[PDB]
Design a protein around this nucleic acid. Sequence first.
RNA 1: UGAUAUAAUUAUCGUACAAGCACUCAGCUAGUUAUUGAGAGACACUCACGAGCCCAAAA
RNA 2: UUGCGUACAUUCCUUAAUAUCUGGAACGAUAGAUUAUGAUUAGGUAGUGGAAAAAAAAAAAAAAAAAAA
RNA 3: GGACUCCUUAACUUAAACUGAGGAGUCAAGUAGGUACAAACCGUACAAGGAUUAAUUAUGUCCAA
RNA 4: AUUAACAUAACAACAU
RNA 5: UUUUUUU
RNA 6: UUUUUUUUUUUUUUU
Lengths: 47, 52, 85, 340, 53, 121, 86, 35, 127, 53, 202
Amino acid sequence: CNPQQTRRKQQYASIIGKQGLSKKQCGIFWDYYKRKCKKRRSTKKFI
Amino acid sequence: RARIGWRKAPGKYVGVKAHPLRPHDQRIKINKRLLWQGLKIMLSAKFAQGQI
Amino acid sequence: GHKHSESVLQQFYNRLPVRKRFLKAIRKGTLIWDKGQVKIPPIAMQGYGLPNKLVLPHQKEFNNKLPKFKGKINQLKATRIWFQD
Amino acid sequence: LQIYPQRRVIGHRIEIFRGKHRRRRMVPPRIPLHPLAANTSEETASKDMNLFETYRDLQLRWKKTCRQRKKKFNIARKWRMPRNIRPLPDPSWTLVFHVNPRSGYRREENILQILARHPEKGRVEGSGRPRGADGWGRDGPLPQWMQILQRTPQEELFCVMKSNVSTQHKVTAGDLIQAEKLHRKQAGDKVVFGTVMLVGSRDWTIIGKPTVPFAKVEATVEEQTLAGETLSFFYRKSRRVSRFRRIRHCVTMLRIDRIVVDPNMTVDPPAPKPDRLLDLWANRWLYPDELDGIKRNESGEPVVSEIYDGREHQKGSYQRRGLTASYRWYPDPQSAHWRP
Amino acid sequence: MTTREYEEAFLPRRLKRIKVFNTPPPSELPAFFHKRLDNAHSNPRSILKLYRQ
Amino acid sequence: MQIPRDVIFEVVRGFRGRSRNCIKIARVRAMKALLYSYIMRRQRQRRYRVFWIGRINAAGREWSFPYAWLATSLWRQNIWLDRKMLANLAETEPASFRALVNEGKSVYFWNPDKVRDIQDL
Amino acid sequence: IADRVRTSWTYRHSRYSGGVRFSLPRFMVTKRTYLSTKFRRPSTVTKWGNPQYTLPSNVQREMQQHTPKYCDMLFLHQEDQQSRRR
Amino acid sequence: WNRNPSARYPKKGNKGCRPVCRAMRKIRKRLRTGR
Amino acid sequence: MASRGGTLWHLKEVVIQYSASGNSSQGLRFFFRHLLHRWKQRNPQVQVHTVENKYEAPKATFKYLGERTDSRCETPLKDLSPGQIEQILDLHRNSKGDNRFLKHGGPRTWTERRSIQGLWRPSLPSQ
Amino acid sequence: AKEAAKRINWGAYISHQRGVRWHPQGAWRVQFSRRNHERNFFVRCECYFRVGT
Amino acid sequence: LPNPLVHLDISIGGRDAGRMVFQLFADTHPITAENFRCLCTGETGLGYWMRPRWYKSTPFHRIVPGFMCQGGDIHRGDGRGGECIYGQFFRDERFLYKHSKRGLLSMAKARRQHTNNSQFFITFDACPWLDGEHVVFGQLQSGAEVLDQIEEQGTPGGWRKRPVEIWNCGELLLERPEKLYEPSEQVIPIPDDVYIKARRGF
RNA sequence: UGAUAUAAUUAUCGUACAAGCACUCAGCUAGUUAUUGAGAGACACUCACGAGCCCAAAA
RNA sequence: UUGCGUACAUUCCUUAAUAUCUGGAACGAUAGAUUAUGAUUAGGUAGUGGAAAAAAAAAAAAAAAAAAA
RNA sequence: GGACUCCUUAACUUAAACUGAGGAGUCAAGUAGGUACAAACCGUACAAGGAUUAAUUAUGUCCAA
RNA sequence: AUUAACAUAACAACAU
RNA sequence: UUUUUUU
RNA sequence: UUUUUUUUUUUUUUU
């Protein structure tokens, strides 16, 4: 309930919209970014 | 200094909450008629869209 | 000064840029302050009429009919005279 | 116990009004009521039955409990004393000369010399309203020597025009002026302001009491965008009240080109008749390509014209869209628009 | 009762005062002044004021 | 709450120590800073109208013609010129101003129906 | 949606609520970071945003007679006196 | 005598003859009307 | 905007970043098929470029001709109508820039020649 | 009221034309609204015909 | 019914000038005519300011030779005053007649639109430019010698050489100017009386 | 240099003002919940069926 | 005698109206582009009401879209 | 279960900003203006918002202005 | 390795 | 840009 | 005799 959350959200938002990001690059958001990418890749799956 | 009672009380400690979450059930009630109708509507939609 | 509160009338006097000699007189009553000047208070003579500037608007008509003095202080023959408040 | 009324009217008569003290309607009714009755029937009819008094009414007046709120009704303030300036004299303009032949100051030519000696000879007075063969002159045509006014260059010319209904600016040769938003205007749009109050030069000064009907200003739209952001804040301490806003005002930029002064000028033509009425209410003018679908008769005029000519329906309508030759306002006798 | 000042204290200061007495004006100036001249015979100021009027 | 946090910092740019950086102090500072401008922008008009009137009177007095008279003279003539343009003229166009003053004087100053000469008397 | 809020009995449904009207002036303000002009204005720009110069015209021309400044008040006074005394 | 406090300073021009917290207004009238 | 008699424009280049799969870019996509071609022709003096980006919100950047700091601007185009887009475009084209210093008010006049006749100075008659 | 109603002529305000209506301002209002997103053309006529004119 | 015939007695510098007679156009301008007749007769009583609404003893605040002469103020007598029987201000009337005759009467106006009051003015000459801006309701029938004398007291600046005031007023008991357009009948769905009746409960 | 301006918060009839807290910043922290309630002239959303509606626990 | 200074225009430009009555019971309609002389309007403690936002997580709808590549 | 002022009036030392009643305005919940300096008095065509414009009001017109 | 408060330094300024 | 003092 | 008042924020009383 604070300034810290705004910084984290701004940081997150700045990296979310990209591709080919490394684990060392992502940081604390690595899990989130991996889930996002896997979610995205769902549309390309056919019978 | 200000008054203080319990060591572990809301605001005086980390983890204590005044309105903590409680386990419960997320199930809801619904009329059978609604379901019955929605089945039909879905079926017709399928036909409409050509997914059958 | 040392006094905490003072009367408005006294305060007024206190603000007069004049000598102590005239201040005392003013305080006493022998002198008055008007239009930034100090002069003798008006003289009220017995029987004669007072100045038109001191009576009420409705009293001027009756005051103008009273006798008037057009002489010097030495020639004045009034039984009693005093300053008009 | 009984409280007697007060009949003695001190000051002004009492007048009750609905609502709070604010800016309300002021236009009088079309059908005023006579203050006197010429018959007993009028007297009897004057009675308002809606307002019939009863015991119940008295009850509400006499109750010790909370009564009706005082914010519903109030007493009207006193009347004002406006100045009656109207009517106004006939519009006219006058001309003067103050030539300075001194070398020190100086550092056509023939007449100028004469004028310098006898500036009084140059006193010319006219009329602002149009006339016949006389034109702008008074009791006859203007002198033939007035053509001198067209010989002076723009580098030594200045005038006072009206950019708005109430705003005035000092227009000069190559000037950048600021005005309000002009509807239906884009880049490369030339405009004409015919509204001028005063003209002058190094030799003469056209006073033009009401206006100058033989003078105009030519401008071009240079900018039409939003202004810079502005911050406004207000609050009351110890009362929990405030307001915050972020407004972006709109302005328009106009660049002056020429200041034409021709005494032989003619009155502007009337309002034009557009071919299509849809553009008047549309958000953009129809393109040339789209205008190709316009039906025409043998005479060459639109066929649609038979239904409706297309004349102006309201005062100052086409002027708002800029279809007029020139812009004019109340000060200009040639103008015609709504006035508050 | 009430005073004139009191009454006046609630009205515009420039408000004109009503007229209490009105009479017809003099139609003939020469005849009006000829009768007035009959009373002024010793006061130079009266003669000068009449001539000025 | 009254003001966004992001803007306070901006508004408090250039202030003294602790007041450019402290949220607490900055709040109270900024509030007053905006309030003063808010209040003054409305009163900015009469402060310039009085200056225009003073310049016009100053100008006018030169040619033995008070503003008091001038105004009336002008208005009676159907002349509708704002004090802003009047004052600008008074400074930039002396000749123009003199023209106006002369125009006005004629109207203002009127002779009676009869003129008497008592020089030889 | 629509032009205005409909208060009529005909339009009192839950399906008629919400929405926002488009506004150009407001769109350039809503959801936009504020930037102060203090300590940011160049030397080439006046207070009102008008262009400004930083070099004499003479110099400008080099690196790329005139009307006198003051008028003649004495001539105006003397001419007015002559015209009134004529 | 009644001369120290601020509830007895006369009205000057442009006050309405009844400013906040006055007593002398009602004292003089009363006096004249009967004491 | 017009300058020097309408022989000089400000607006130079316009870049528009959009997406080919995002729903929010629907308006842009629509615009790119009906009004783009029509708009371009009308304004041949302005270059227009488009950039495709999948996982990024749409936006637009504007470049102006000048030495001032107002020679660049940006504006998002998320959840906007074709008409709105057009409006934005027109605004940008008819504007000289973001105008960070442009003040509403002031003398509302800019002239090189303050006085023609001449300025006022004290004189012996006046004194 | 009931008597006045009878006297009042209600038939004059009736207009046999779509888009034309009476207004309490004392005028004839003309309405014509159309939209076109494809061609980017929107029209909203709000013409008024005053009686006093 | 016959039109009213009002009269005005003017006094120049305390001297009886004469007696002018006017004819009001009640037929065409009933309201306007009524206003002026009631003000002249003084049969309405006091007013807003507790003053009698009577033209008696009123000065002329404006006398411009060859243009017109203004007057009628009852409050101050300077010009910044006026009051009709109806109230402060009243709505205007149809502009039928022009200003093309000597001695025509017409009400005054303020900066605002609808600012008509007791203030009127008599035209000395044709004023085409005044067409449509003012309502014409009266015409001089006799007594042009008084208007000729009044014209002499005016100045271009609107100054007054000698005092000019109305001595007595009243009403007498026993060709028209050009027209701006051609009046024609109109459809009147709602009766006039209804408007009156509505304001009282019915 | 010119003009102009009485930190903020709560209570209170009272901007009450020489009353109560706070040096500053970081983290935490005060209206949570209808398998049981509801439209009651100081304000009560919406869907289905209809003289008919729902169906409890096992399953 | 004739004068003059002065606080407040929704003249100009840009917004807003949710307890059944503002024209609107109009127009348009593939889901509303904001009415140009349109009437009443928009100071507010307590109490009451409407609406827009809060960068996150889940969902088996992130390629039928001009030109260019 | 109310603070100041206007009219009437109870109590008091025809005292006190007290204590208590009858009926109008303002503040409370009101901005800016005037009254020299701190809610209550006068005025307001009384604070949605922006700009360098015009006006009879309390009231002013030797200087600070 | 790490935000703010806090601590030090460098550059930038002339109608003075 | 002061007024008044009957016959 | 009048204009000059609590103008009692200061100067000034220039009539």
